[PDB]
Structure formats: structure tokens, C-alpha cells
Amino acid sequence: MLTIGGKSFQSRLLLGTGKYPSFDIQKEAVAVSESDILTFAFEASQPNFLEQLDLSKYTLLPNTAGASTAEEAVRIARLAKASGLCDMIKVEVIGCSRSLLPDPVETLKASEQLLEEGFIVLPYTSDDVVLARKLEELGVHAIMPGASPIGSGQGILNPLNLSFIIEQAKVPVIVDAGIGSPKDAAYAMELGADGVLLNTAVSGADDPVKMARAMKLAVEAGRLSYEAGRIPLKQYG
């Protein structure tokens, strides 16, 4: 199975929790997903989804979502363990106002000092074939390259680069950032991905419930192709 930091999960789908149209839908989409692993990030009373939720059956994936500095990030990480519900981090250094793409220096730097204080680290990175390696070359128990930019579902804008990532790494690889439909989810697994993390496609779907189920199938299908066989691209003279 997919196994990260020595615990395993039968679903190679990781689903996010941001920006759904309603709790009634987020709640439903999450079940229909069959996910285990979900990422999280004075006023007036409202429900909070995490405290309407059994905490045995899932495996929480906090992120550092809102930091620019590996400083600002290190806090959201230690701020996490203060709750004492989590024991796994997603490293996310948004640096570009326009694209929301990982910052190679802070994402790397931050990954080092979280790894000292016994954290389970899986960073968000690019597709610099090497930048994968580098992060992993300092004890990282899962490398998380991004297929496209975040908010826009453009899928794997570059296989090859990520197809390399797969061949060279010894821990698990999970594509996140920018999947748009199953078509994209399933493409990841076929080049050898161990899993797909995705928010926007589901949340923004206008039937996140359905689209949840569809992604849930997609990852499987994809993983089964790779699982064995696959017709070669046929050439002609």
C-alpha cells in the first residue's frame, strides 16, 4: 500500500478541505471520497467541520498555508503539534502572488528544521527533477511535486520532469497542485505516482459530491494500469 513515515493507507487519494460550497457537501464529499488523509489549514457562532469529525479513521495533513518565510511556516507547524491531534506536516511555501508556486529555498530550508524536531514532513515542490531529490536527500518521507499551478486545473503540464521524479526517488511521490479531472488524477498514477492530493477540482466542482466519487475511481483506475501492462504508443515510419 501507500506508506508514509511507516504507517500505511489503503487510499492513494488525499483530499483537501478548502473552499466547498457548504459543510453539508464537504461532509458528504469527504465520505464519498474514501480518503483517509485530509489536509487542513470574537466572531460569531458557526460549525467547525473538524470538531464534527471522528479522528481515529482519518490521518490529518496540516499545511503551512499562509507563510512566506520558512520562519512563518515553522510556527504553523509547531502551532500544529500544540493541538496534539496531528503527527504529519505538509510543507508549503507560496512565494508568487500570481501563481502560488513553491519557494525552492524556504521550502527546502524549512524542510530541514522541521525534520529535526521529529516531524513527518512532506513538502510541496515543483518538478525540478533535482529539487525533488535534494529535499528527499535530507530524510524526507514523501515528496510532493506540483503538476500545474494551484488554483487552475491544467493537469500534468509536464510528465517527463515528473516521470523522472518517479524513477529516481526511494520514498513515496504524491502529485498535488492543479489537477482538474479524473483524466488528470489517473495520469499521475500511470507514470508511477503513489498518490494524488487534490482540493480545487472537488470543492469547486458544482457537484463536489459526484466529482469526489469520480476522483476516487480515477486514482484507482490509473493505479491499476501501471499495476500491470500498458500498450506502447505505436509508431509508424
Binding site: 489549514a41 470574537f42 466572531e43 467547525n48 467541520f49 473538524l50 470538531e51 493541538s83 496534539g84
Partner: protein
């Protein structure tokens, strides 16, 4: 009289802990995280950590 979340504010009856502080705000039962003097303060230490009245607490919630 404590630093509180962007504002400067009063604290009635002097002696007190963090547990108390969330009592006056209506989120004793809710979800929260709280930081006294850029040092993070957690759920399990709620009775035990006393306000040295004048200082910096940053309270937060989980939002989308």
C-alpha cells in the same frame, strides 16, 4: 490589563489563568489555539498556566 489580538484591553479581578480567559469570550467549548508571549499555549495546560496579566496572547480558529 493584557495585549489582546491587535487591541489594548482590561482584565477583571486580577488573579487568573488561560482557562478563565476563554470563559469571558464564549469559546470554552469550541476550537481554539492561543499564544502567550510568542510562546504557544495548548489545551492540556489550561488550568495550570496563569496570566502574568500584562502580555501577548494570539487566539486562532480553522477557516477554509
Amino acid at each position: 490589563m493584557l495585549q489582546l489580538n491587535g487591541k489594548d484591553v482590561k482584565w477583571k479581578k486580577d488573579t487568573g489563568t488561560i482557562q478563565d480567559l476563554l470563559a469571558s469570550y464564549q469559546l470554552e467549548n469550541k476550537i481554539v489555539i492561543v499564544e502567550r508571549n510568542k510562546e504557544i499555549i495548548g489545551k492540556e495546560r489550561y488550568h495550570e498556566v496563569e496570566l502574568c496579566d500584562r502580555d501577548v496572547i494570539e487566539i486562532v480558529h480553522f477557516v477554509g
